[PDB]
Assembly symmetry: C3
């Protein structure tokens, strides 16, 4: 199967690869088609699922839920991850995209997740983004409430800078279980700004998402050189696809990030998990890396 | 009145709003006019006053002092804040603008403040700026001297980065009481570089100054969009003035900064303190913020 | 002689100025000419020597060694510093310049240093550069091995950011003895990004190298203004040369860096060490600094 990994000190055990339902709507899938899509990725080994507040105009959690309703026994076999803290214009209350990391709202979204997902509990809850107006005390007070009722068992953050992660962390009696961030050849800032070193140092493993199926290639020649490099390295490793070379590039990071998969086909999901068997050489990591950038060192 | 606030763990109690005498000379005010200007802001609730070394070509402290001489009993009713560490070309010894954070000089300026201000003690003393040549041991040795004589009772810094604040802090047996910094829609770097998170994390409240009466609008169309936004939000909050909307924008920061007021009229001072009653919405904070920048998130 | 300085808490005693053999090959020097060059700088007081993995296409250590072979008793009188972690195209295994901070390789290079240098032990070993793929545990495991055999007695790093230095440091039972970095008017980033404050805070002294004999002047008018300023300040201090003014500029940093000298003539080496007697004024430090930049503050 897929390797199992404890995301943090007092944290939970997750599957190295997580299924992300960011684009569940795009898949034009039906409830009985999802219960079977799930089972198939659950059987592959991918048992951790990534959901969020605003994903799909506040529809994805609901959709997933309908399916969880068809096979209620599927919960035990999985670990659910959801988020809150973001306010999109998909709602009329939000004329502008702003953040909301206030107590009641975090409790609100949390409890709304349980309902939409048709579950009595979330394995992990993350503050979607760092809000300039975030008050670590207020958030930490929200977490204490959700935890006190067994509604949420582990807490985390997403897209937090070392400084923000440390701020919120100085207020919680429990260990932030992760910092879900964006990591890939096309987006490597997190590799040098301290974010991944803090994670490795604290032994907290990052859930990594890479806008893959987005098509951020072939239509932005800025990264043609990376396209050409991910292509040759792919043959060298005799991999199934360049996307597979990308998943393995992330897996090599010393922080041991858990790559998030965004696809609607078990076969591509299988191929993604197959990245755990590519023997990428340091030289191949740097060569990929360098082509995305354009220089050495 | 104005809210009272303990600026830091073992720190002093200050008034949420402080009177800043940066432009005391510009006000072409007389000594008896200042003793009465003071009383009036002391009666409004603003009891903490901000002074500095180089302010007014080394004249402002002296001026304030003359006035403190007319009503000696005004001291007890206030808290004095002054600074040192900057060397301006307003003096012939300084052919160039450099920093001086050496022991004797910090003691020198300090003691010179007491004399100019006509007081036996300063409530708080700040290192004006971070000097690349700053030696935390040397400064900390200076602070120990000034404190030992009751001449200075609390120490702080101004415009220090998290790294510099931590460096000096690792040498003092007492807690740095603040990091007086610049915060406003026009200057928001401190909102994302860690500076305010460190403050909130350590529970040290920042004295915030915003070059307001400078006229950094109407003559720099770069911030016309912010001008237009601070204008509409002002009507929405039915505030006295856009300047009042600005003071409230700062007050909303989770770090609870103490806004510094730079004006020479009790009425505008009153209006400034009136910002504690504007009910700014998160959406209104972000909209202001965003107009200054030019993008979301 | 040259001042002696303990580079860190549980660290070794070094000479304020270290001899760097980065360009030993360029000197077209012979083995018996080096044994005598060494003695002469050993007699001047400079007893700490800086070597590295890739320096001179993997030839410099060997060269130095041949000379150490002629006067075996020269070891006791010196302190040897070497590095590893960099992979240059000077080797056919490295088609591209990448980093290698994996266990066996660190042990490999280390042991190869002992052989090339003709010594049973290295006083200090540094990880050449921070590798995005660096695993603090792996490196720390390498250090524990080398130390366990007395082969290496002190460990350090080079060109690490505060975050990287802290990461590796959280894994070692001993104190990183230094962070050898580049410091000079032409390269002052380290003066504001936290690097030198971390060092001063932890009391770890940085080995500083400044590409001096490179001729980064007279052929890059971008720094003519700095050329002109280092020239006048030189007369003011009545120094031997502008290079001497540069060495003293570095020596003034509060972090007390140990300047590394890259020259092949004892006379210039003497002149370098002579920088410990120039009485640079704060004003002269800033004026130099400012000319390199182009603005005040």
């Amino acid at each position: 199967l897929v390797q199992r990994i404890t995301i943090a000190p007092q944290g939970p055990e997750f599957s190295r690869f997580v299924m992300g339902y960011w684009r569940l709507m795009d898949w034009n899938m039906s409830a009985r088609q999802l219960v079977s899509f799930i089972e198939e990725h659950l059987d592959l080994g991918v048992t951790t699922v990534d959901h969020a507040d605003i994903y799909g105009g506040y529809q994805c959690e609901a959709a997933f839920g309908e399916a969880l309703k068809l096979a209620p026994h599927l919960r035990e076999r999985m670990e659910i991850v959801s988020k809150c803290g973001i306010a999109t214009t998909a709602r009329e209350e939000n004329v502008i995209g702003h953040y909301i990391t206030d107590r009641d709202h975090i409790i609100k979204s949390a409890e709304q997740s349980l309902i939409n997902l048709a579950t009595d509990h979330l394995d992990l809850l993350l503050i979607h983004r760092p809000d300039p107006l975030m008050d670590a005390d207020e958030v930490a007070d929200a977490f204490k409430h959700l935890h006190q009722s067994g509604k949420v068992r582990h807490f985390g953050v997403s897209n937090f800078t070392p400084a923000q992660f440390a701020l919120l962390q100085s207020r919680l009696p429990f260990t932030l279980a992760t910092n879900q961030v964006e990591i890939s050849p096309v987006h490597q800032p997190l590799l040098l700004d301290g974010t991944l070193d803090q994670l490795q140092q604290l032994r907290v493993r990052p859930m990594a998402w890479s806008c893959l199926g987005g098509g951020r290639l072939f239509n932005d020649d800025y990264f043609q050189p990376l396209r050409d490099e991910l292509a040759v390295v792919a043959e060298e490793l005799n991999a199934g696809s360049i996307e597979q070379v990308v998943n393995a590039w992330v897996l090599r990071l010393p922080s041991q990030p858990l790559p998030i998969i965004g696809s609607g086909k078990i076969e591509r999901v299988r191929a993604a998990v197959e990245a755990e068997t590519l023997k990428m050489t340091r030289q191949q990591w740097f060569r990929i890396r360098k082509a995305a950038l354009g220089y050495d060192v």
